[PDB]
Amino acid sequence: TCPFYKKIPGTGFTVDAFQYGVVEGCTAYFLTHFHSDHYAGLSKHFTFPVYCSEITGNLLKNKLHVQEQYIHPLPLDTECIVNGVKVVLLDANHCPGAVMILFYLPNGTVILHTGDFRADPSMERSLLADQKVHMLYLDTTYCSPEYTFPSQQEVIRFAINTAFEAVTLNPHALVVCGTYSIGKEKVFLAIADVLGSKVGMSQEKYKTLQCLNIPEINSLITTDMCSSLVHLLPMMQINFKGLQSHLKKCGGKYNQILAFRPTGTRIADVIPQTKGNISIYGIPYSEHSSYLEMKRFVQWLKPQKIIPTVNVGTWKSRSTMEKYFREWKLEAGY
Numbered sequence: 001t002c003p004f005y006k007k008i009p010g011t012g013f014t015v016d017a018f019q020y021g022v023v024e025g026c027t028a029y030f031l032t033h034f035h036s037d038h039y040a041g042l043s044k045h046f047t048f049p050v051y052c053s054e055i056t057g058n059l060l061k062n063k064l065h066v067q068e069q070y071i072h073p074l075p076l077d078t079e080c081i082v083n084g085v086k087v088v089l090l091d092a093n094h095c096p097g098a099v100m101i102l103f104y105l106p107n108g109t110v111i112l113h114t115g116d117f118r119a120d121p122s123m124e125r126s127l128l129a130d131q132k133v134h135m136l137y138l139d140t141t142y143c144s145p146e147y148t149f150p151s152q153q154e155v156i157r158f159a160i161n162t163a164f165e166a167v168t169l170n171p172h173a174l175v176v177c178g179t180y181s182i183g184k185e186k187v188f189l190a191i192a193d194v195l196g197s198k199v200g201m202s203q204e205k206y207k208t209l210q211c212l213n214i215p216e217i218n219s220l221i222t223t224d225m226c227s228s229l230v231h232l233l234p235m236m237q238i239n240f241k242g243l244q245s246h247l248k249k250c251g252g253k254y255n256q257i258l259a260f261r262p263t264g265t266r267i268a269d270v271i272p273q274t275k276g277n278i279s280i281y282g283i284p285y286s287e288h289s290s291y292l293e294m295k296r297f298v299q300w301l302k303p304q305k306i307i308p309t310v311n312v313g314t315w316k317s318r319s320t321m322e323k324y325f326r327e328w329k330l331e332a333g334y
């Protein structure tokens, strides 16, 4: 059945609750972002209306083939009505099109649903600050102190640097990036930027990127591999065996590959794995809050209830996160 943590109490709304068939007493459904944990169940003939950002809707429309009529896009940083409830979508600083949602219930209660997000101080200078928020549905993906990774700013600076090095050194060398779902585009876009390349890819992915309407995207991407000296390949293809296969299958224009895996302490001290003329790099590009980013965020927010939405399936997990919420409540004095 649909769990209590996917339901907005007060309304008949749900958030990312498409894998449960029809939820009883659910007048509208909300999609925070286009990630498959969060959209599973959305067939092209899903018959209830869906509320989301523009971008998430494009991806629904084109990848999952749902009809304009059942797809209600909504602008960011704007007060909107939906089944007579005030709602606002805020940028989640997650993947393209991802949003947090504020529900302003008619009784007076105000609910933030982070969805997936990467807490940032800039969110404290937002619509959020214009009132107290009582309940918080919290992306707790990394709610544990060992989870510390650097700023996206650092990683990309590094990856830009590692890139401009290897190509200025060997101008017949190819940067490659790993990828599966949307997100982490700034990695591969920022390298292409600095080497004045376009970004080559398979068509599914090219299509996926055309949904996101990035400024001047046509001039930053392509499906003809040859012309692009930075290529995106599926994450599974990012191994020495796969990168040989790829370098044969270009017609011998590139003699050396610099790869990147974006999934997973100091950044300058990072060292690759080299086997041949193939350097692979594991880089920690998160689009989720670290322990401290989250902490700061919630401690600023000072919510009354907090409802975690992630690592929710076991009691060890549930009570460990509840301990950290107690610590934060106490430390900040709310």
Ligand SMILES: CO/N=C(/C(=O)N[C@@H]1C(=O)N2C(C(=O)O)=C(CSc3nc(=O)c(=O)[nH]n3C)CS[C@H]12)c1csc(N)n1
Binding pocket: 035, 036, 037, 038, 116, 141, 263
């Ligand atoms: C092939 O599958 N890939 C993995 C794997 O988990 N790789 C990376 C890893 O640890 N990752 C993490 C994360 O760290 O949370 C994540 C992020 S969790 C997540 N984030 C979302 O934004 C979202 O919408 N849904 N989810 C679930 C999943 S893959 C990546 C794998 C399987 S076996 C193996 N060696 N790794």
Ligand code: NI
Binding pocket: 033, 035, 094, 116
């Ligand atoms: Ni996500």
